[PDB]
Design a protein around this ligand. Structure first.
Ligand SMILES: O=C(c1ccc(Br)c([N+](=O)[O-])c1)N1CCN(c2ccccc2F)CC1
Length: 297
């Protein structure tokens, strides 16, 4: 492609050798063969974009390296990208409402975890859709979600990879449940369902860690009891914490990267409405920004 080539060699392309098998740089024989035949099948069908190792290995991992199922998942994704306009969302969609409604559903990226992943924060427990729907719609909240996803893929992950010295394909999510009720949980359920559907089918294998904090007692207790029955890959990725989550977060995120309100030392200018409207991280550092240029605001 010659633009993509330049871009792909501008950040580290191998995962650390202790990552899960089937990740870039960690391929078994016939995990290399499955990658090759998936590519030629997508080429024979006329696809020319997003045929890099990282991308195709995510679709393969999501289908246990069943090549035909991974191909069908990829084709389904490209069809959604065309119907939804995803390839041009960064230029077409403008979430001008965000300063008005961010406080009614706080969502923000902030710095990185110890593995180099960008950290994504979601204060779901504070959600107030009754006030949000005075100004925006669920449809526009989802466009904004995909807008941010495209910005993670095009800008944040390449910069995080450079800052980390190795390929970074995934994020660390912190979802704060402080404040949910049964009522507000039902009110946010449709958005969460659509978001999760988009994530799993169109962004497979992008979830690296997922921490729920300030979980209600019954919710946290259910997880405590059934942990022994989750596959050990899942149990190293999902954490359901109650009120005392700070020490657990600090095992995964450097204290100088974790916001103070969650037990860390990272501070933003609260006068510029900083945390809820900030986007601080290696992707805002010129020494980690490559030929793609800096991510938009
Ligand atoms: O799978 C993902 C996910 C999807 C796409 C992308 Br580009 C990233 N990423 O690397 O930032 C993560 N997530 C896990 C589930 N997520 C989620 C789902 C429903 C509601 C709220 C959420 F935060 C979002 C993050």
């Amino acid at each position: 492609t010659q633009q993509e080539k330049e871009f792909l060699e501008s950040y580290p392309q191998n995962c650390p050798p202790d990552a899960l098998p089937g990740t870039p740089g960690n391929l078994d024989s016939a995990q290399e063969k499955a990658l090759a035949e998936l590519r030629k099948l997508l080429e024979d069908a006329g696809f020319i974009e997003r045929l890099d190792d990282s991308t195709l290995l995510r679709f393969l991992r999501a289908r246990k390296f069943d090549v035909q199922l991974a191909k069908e998942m990829f084709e389904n994704c490209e069809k959604w990208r065309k119907d939804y306009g995803t390839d041009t969302i960064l230029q077409d969609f403008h979430y001008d409402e965000k300063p008005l409604i961010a406080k009614f559903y706080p969502q923000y990226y902030h710095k990185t975890d110890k593995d180099g992943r960008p950290v994504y924060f979601e204060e779901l427990g504070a959600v107030n859709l009754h006030e949000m729907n005075k100004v925006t719609s669920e449809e526009r909240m989802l466009k904004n979600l995909v807008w941010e996803y495209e910005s993670v893929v095009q800008y944040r992950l390449p910069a995080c990879s450079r800052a980390a010295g190795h390929l970074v394909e995934t994020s660390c999510t912190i979802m704060d449940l402080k404040g949910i009720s049964i009522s507000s949980a039902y009110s946010v359920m449709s958005y969460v369902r659509e978001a999760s559907y988009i994530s799993q089918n169109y962004y497979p294998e992008r979830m690296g860690k997922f921490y729920i904090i300030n979980a209600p007692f019954g919710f946290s207790t259910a997880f405590r009891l059934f942990k022994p029955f989750l596959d050990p890959v899942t149990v190293s990725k999902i954490f359901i914490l109650g009120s005392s989550y700070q020490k657990e977060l600090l095992k995964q995120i450097p204290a100088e990267n974790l916001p103070v309100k969650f037990g860390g030392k990272s501070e933003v200018d609260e006068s510029k409405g900083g945390l809820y409207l900030s986007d601080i991280g290696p992707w805002r550092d010129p020494k980690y920004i490559g030929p793609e240029g800096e991510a938009p605001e």
